């Protein structure tokens, strides 16, 4: 958020990384600490060597960051659960994304709002003849 501290991973460069639109429009960065120096697969292609301690890597979109995060904790015995994914703007504006409230979205947590929650069954959706000519869908109401 304030600063993106981290060492760039050992990698000989690849063509699957970020592009011109990815630098001008938006790019994503992920920061994590490695217990030691090991090899990890790049979500863009190839195999890289993560530095010992705090690491930093910039990617094109968010799904790449989350795919690397789901790889870090599952393949290595010193599992990495402190990987933090940030979205970077063209104005240097960096905001927090994953994890949201410091806890993984898997398990429940106190302090979250119900978004998209409905109080009905799918077989209880209204008929499309009652809402036609209105800018609303059977699921939006």
């Amino acid at each position: 958020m304030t600063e993106l501290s981290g060492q760039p991973p050992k990698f000989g460069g690849s063509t699957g990384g970020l592009l011109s639109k990815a630098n001008r429009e938006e790019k994503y960065a992920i920061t994590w600490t490695s217990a030691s120096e090991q090899v990890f697969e790049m979500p863009t292609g190839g195999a890289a060597i993560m530095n010992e301690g705090e690491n930093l890597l910039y990617l094109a979109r968010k799904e790449q960051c989350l795919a690397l995060g789901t790889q870090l904790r599952t393949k290595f015995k010193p599992k990495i659960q402190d990987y933090k994914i940030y979205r970077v703007y063209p104005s240097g504006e960096v905001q927090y994304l994953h994890p949201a409230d410091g806890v993984f979205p898997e398990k429940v947590n106190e302090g979250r709002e119900a978004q998209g929650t409905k109080t009905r069954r799918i077989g209880q959706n209204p008929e499309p003849v009652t809402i036609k000519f209105s800018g609303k869908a059977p699921y939006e109401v």
């Binding site: 979109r61 949201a100 409905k118």
Partner: protein, 80 residues
């Protein structure tokens, strides 16, 4: 952006969140099931619509529904 809803038939098993590859879904404490939790979709802006949640639903027919909508750069999964 796509629309993600969660119905009261949800048993709160976190499977749809464990299968989501873009941190779109979360889990909030509820009072309907034994687990006392229900799925939530706060960050619909990161939802591509790969239906990985609906695939990982246990209830009789889905309890979470995804309705594709106006596709954008983020929903189209554009990396270039």
């Amino acid at each position: 952006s796509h629309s993600v809803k969660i119905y009261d038939t949800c048993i709160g098993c976190t499977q749809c969140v464990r299968a989501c590859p873009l941190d779109v879904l979360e889990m909030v404490p509820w009072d309907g099931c034994k687990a006392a939790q229900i799925a939530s979709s706060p960050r619909t802006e990161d939802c591509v619509g790969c239906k990985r949640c609906e695939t990982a639903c246990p209830t009789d027919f889905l309890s979470i529904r995804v309705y594709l909508g106006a596709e954008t750069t983020r929903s189209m999964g554009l990396a270039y």
